[model samples]
Target: SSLLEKGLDGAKKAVGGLGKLGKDAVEDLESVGKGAVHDVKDVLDSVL
Candidate 1:
């Protein structure tokens, strides 16, 4: 029973870490997308 409890705690920590990592990844992707849009607008403006 003690071993099982320890294992559960470990799993919980792992899951929490993963949640943080996922959030960071989403934020990074959003930033990259915004940069891409800005770059495209600059290119279009230069061309016109």
Candidate 2:
């Protein structure tokens, strides 16, 4: 049972690390896109 638990923990650790990596990349893209697009949109919203 302890060996099985150890293997389960290993899978959780591996998947958790990869998930965070993906979240990090997507969050950065989202932040940059939101800022860049929103800035231009603000001017367009008023200038028109």
Candidate 3:
């Protein structure tokens, strides 16, 4: 049956969807880290 091909395509689609989610998570964390750095800079200035 040719359903295997369709099944494989579905698997690949789901796999890539997971990859995109992984990528988005990194970027979201990166922005959070940037905010943390901004706070750290303020802390340093207060210490000065």
Question: lDDT for model 3, on a 0 to 1 scale?
Answer: 0.54
Which digits, one per residue and each the tens of the lDDT, describe model 2 over residues 1-48?
A: 346654452354345775665445544565466686764677699784
lDDT of each: 0.55, 0.55, 0.54
lDDT digits (tens) for residues 1-48 of candidate 1: 346654552343335675665344544565466686765687699884
Better of 1 and 3 by TM-score: 1
Model 2 pairs whose backbones collide: none
lDDT value for model 1: 0.55
State the lDDT of candidate 3 residue by residue for 1-48, as single tens digits.
247655442343345675665445544555466686765677699884
What are the TM-scores, per candidate, against the unseen true structure? 0.27, 0.26, 0.26
Q: For candidate 1, which ten residues in a row score worst on lDDT?
A: 5-14
Please state every model's RMSD to the true fold in angstroms.
Answer: 15.9, 15.2, 15.8
For candidate 1, the per-residue lDDT at 21 reads 54
Error of 3 at 31 (Å): 10
Evaluation by lDDT, superior candidate among 2 and 3? 2
- Model 2's alpha-carbon lDDT is 0.55
